[PDB]
């Protein structure tokens, strides 16, 4: 009940900060600072307990749902801002970016992806760290898909700056449109994708029998800055590991073939 205020305050701020950042590139610092606070807020044990204590299903669910959407748009823009800034000759980071760009290597596991493997990232974004960091680290081919053309465009330009000689392709194709989906060994889903589990189910018959999927997600209080986990259809995708990260904004669920 008491916490309710904070979330509605965040929702209003994120709504205001987003509209302001679009029309004027002066309120960037404000948005980045807001996301740095939000990132810290969801990793605070105090507010986690307060959040979990709150019950009222309908109202809470709608509030979480409303927060998921606005923060989705904010992450998109914060990536665009970082992309434009790098292209303008200035590397940068934030509390938010520093949090997530840590354990991108060991999302599947330590020394899991080899040189011969091929990773597919669903929802690459304007600043595709995952593509760049995996490509340079493992020396593997990596693909990125995004429904946003701005993300595709900037993504290609950023890849060209940071990893020009690595095998990195980004398109606006869907999993069904990908020609060499059968050769894909690893698949990462971005947390903030509302159709990620819908595309998971689809990818079963498209992918080979040795494929492994890393689904980024956030349950409980993290669900305000993430789309949560879900049950998967029986005798298809099997959750072999749920990787909770108490100091990171998103957790990881590993899916493999049932046989």
| Cβ count near 2 (within 10 Å) | 8
Q: Does residue 99 belong to the site contacting ligand FN6 (CB under 6 A)? A: no
CB of 1 to ligand MTA, least distance (A): 33
Of 122, 132, 134, 135, the residue at the interface with ligand MTA (CB under 6 A) is 122
> Which residue from 127, 73, 69, 62 is spatially nearest to 100, judged by alpha carbons?
127
Structure tokens at 179: 């020609």
Nearer to ligand MTA, 72 or 221 (CB): 72
162 binds, among ligand FN6, ligand MTA, none (CB under 5 to 8 A by kind): none
H runs (alpha helix) in 101-233: 129-138, 149-162, 196-206
CB of 191 to ligand MTA, least distance (A): 8
Q: Does residue 249 belong to the site contacting ligand FN6 (CB under 6 A)? A: yes
Of 147, 161, 240, 258, the residue at the interface with ligand MTA (CB under 6 A) is 147
φ/ψ of residue 247, rounded to 5: -110, 0
Q: Please answer whether residues 143 and 170 qualify as being in contact, where contact means their C-beta atoms are separated by less than 8 angstroms.
A: yes
Q: Does residue 108 belong to the site contacting ligand FN6 (CB under 6 A)? A: no
Three-class SS state of 236: coil
- Give the range of 15-23, 31-39, 84-92, 139-147 binding ligand MTA by CB under 6 A: 139-147
Asked whether the CA dihedral 178, 243, 195, 73 is positive or negative, the reply is negative
Residues contributing to the site for ligand MTA (CB under 6 A): 75-76, 79, 122-123, 125, 145-148, 151, 190, 192-193, 195
């Amino acid at each position: 009940n008491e916490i309710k205020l904070i979330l509605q305050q965040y929702l209003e701020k994120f709504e205001a900060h987003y509209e302001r950042v679009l029309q004027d590139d002066q309120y960037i610092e404000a948005l980045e600072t807001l996301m740095d606070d939000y990132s810290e807020f969801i990793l605070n044990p105090i507010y986690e307990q307060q959040f979990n204590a709150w019950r009222d299903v309908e109202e809470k669910a709608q509030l979480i749902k409303s927060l998921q959407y606005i923060t989705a748009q904010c992450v998109k823009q914060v990536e665009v801002i970082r992309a434009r800034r790098l292209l303008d000759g200035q590397a940068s980071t934030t509390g938010y970016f520093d949090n997530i760009e840590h354990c991108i290597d060991e999302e599947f596991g330590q020394c899991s992806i080899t040189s011969n493997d091929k990773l597919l990232l669903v929802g690459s974004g304007a600043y595709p760290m995952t593509l760049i960091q995996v490509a340079k680290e493992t020396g593997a081919s990596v693909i990125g898909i995004d429904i946003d053309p701005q993300a595709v465009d900037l993504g290609r330009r950023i890849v060209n700056v940071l990893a020009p000689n690595e095998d990195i392709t980004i398109t606006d194709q869907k999993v069904s449109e990908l020609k060499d989906i059968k050769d894909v060994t690893h698949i990462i889903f971005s947390s903030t994708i509302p159709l990620k589990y819908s595309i998971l189910e689809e990818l079963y018959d498209l992918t080979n029998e040795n494929v492994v999927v890393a689904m980024r997600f956030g349950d409980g209080i993290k669900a305000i800055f993430n789309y949560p986990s879900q049950e998967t259809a029986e005798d298809k995708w099997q959750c072999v590991n749920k990787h909770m990260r108490p100091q990171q904004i998103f957790d990881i669920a590993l899916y493999k073939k049932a046989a």
